[PDB]
Design a binder for this molecule. Structure first.
Ligand SMILES: Nc1ncnc2c1ncn2[C@@H]1O[C@H](CSCC[C@H](N)C(=O)O)[C@@H](O)[C@H]1O
Ligand SMILES: [Zn+2]
Ligand SMILES: [Zn+2]
Ligand SMILES: [Zn+2]
Ligand SMILES: [Zn+2]
Lengths: 9, 261
């Protein structure tokens, strides 16, 4: 977990 | 003054070379990844390539008219004559772009074709003082210009959740809620090296070209303003990225409006 560190924003 | 540790990291695969220089330390040109100029897979994505599923235009002109179906799919064709995004283009919530394709009746040099013509800017991979490697422009880039595509390995939601080297992920979230990802960790192009900036001179836009499978937009960076020769490229990695990496390090983009410092 945490989650996923994907772009963008 | 520096060290030209490569004449072209793309090995001739891009329309223009992308040299690597290091003016800062002894790190040689990065080699822990494979440069690829287009997206790849390492595990079947069933991308719908059925040519009869493409929507296409029947324009008898250069696709400048209000009637271009591909323009309508995009809301309107956003490209001017020089290939630049119109000033009225919404960089805060960019629309999906559909470029004309091989199913269209129009010619290859039609107006609705930009991203598919590949790299037109002179870029350079260089070593930053604060952030590792980065990419800078070697010339003035006008605003609304296509600069580069975020290229890497197309993978699934759940495969992406298990990737331990996670500094190169780009999520593709459909409006339908479906999610895939581009991982530029092992296979990637120059975009893997573009750093986050809180006042970005680049914005990513979802674009469709040879296929219109909405699960797999391709990610195109357009300049949001004039970028000056020598200027480092940057886009906003976004909040999902920082909520996680922010626990490990802080943004050093150096902006006085830095939101993650
Ligand atoms: N604005 C920023 N501030 C601090 N570090 C950054 C940053 N933008 C990118 N990075 C660094 O670069 C990683 C993203 S991959 C970007 C390329 C990287 N600089 C490289 O040399 O390969 C981040 O996890 C962080 O290590
Ligand atoms: Zn058309
Ligand atoms: Zn068309
Ligand atoms: Zn066309
Ligand atoms: Zn910042």
């Amino acid at each position: 977990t945490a989650r996923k560190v994907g772009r963008p924003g | 003054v520096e060290r030209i540790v490569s004449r072209d990291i793309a090995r001739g695969y891009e329309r223009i070379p992308i040299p690597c220089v290091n003016a800062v330390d002894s790190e040689p040109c990065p080699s822990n990844y494979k440069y690829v100029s287009q997206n790849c897979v390492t595990s079947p994505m069933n991308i719908d390539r059925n040519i009869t599923h493409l929507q296409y235009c029947v324009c008898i002109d250069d696709c400048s008219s209000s009637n271009c179906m591909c323009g309508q799919l995009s809301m309107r064709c956003w490209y001017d004559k020089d290939g630049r995004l119109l000033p009225e283009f919404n960089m805060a919530e960019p629309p999906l772009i559909f470029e004309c394709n091989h199913a269209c009746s129009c010619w290859r040099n039609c107006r609705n074709r930009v991203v598919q013509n590949g790299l037109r800017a002179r870029l350079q991979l260089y070593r930053t003082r604060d952030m590792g490697w980065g990419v800078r422009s070697l010339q003035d880039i006008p605003p609304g210009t296509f600069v580069c595509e975020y290229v890497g390995e197309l993978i699934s939601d759940s495969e992406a959740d298990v990737r331990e080297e996670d500094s190169y992920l780009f999520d593709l979230d459909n409006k339908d809620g479906e999610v895939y990802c581009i991982d530029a960790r092992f296979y990637g192009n120059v975009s893997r090296f573009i750093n986050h900036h809180c006042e970005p001179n680049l914005v990513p836009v979802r674009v469709f070209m040879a296929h219109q499978d909405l699960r797999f937009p391709r990610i195109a960076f357009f300049s949001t303003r004039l970028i000056e020769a020598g200027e480092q490229l940057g886009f906003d990695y976004g909040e999902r990225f920082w909520d996680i990496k922010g626990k490990l390090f802080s943004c050093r983009c150096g902006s006085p409006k830095c939101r993650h410092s």
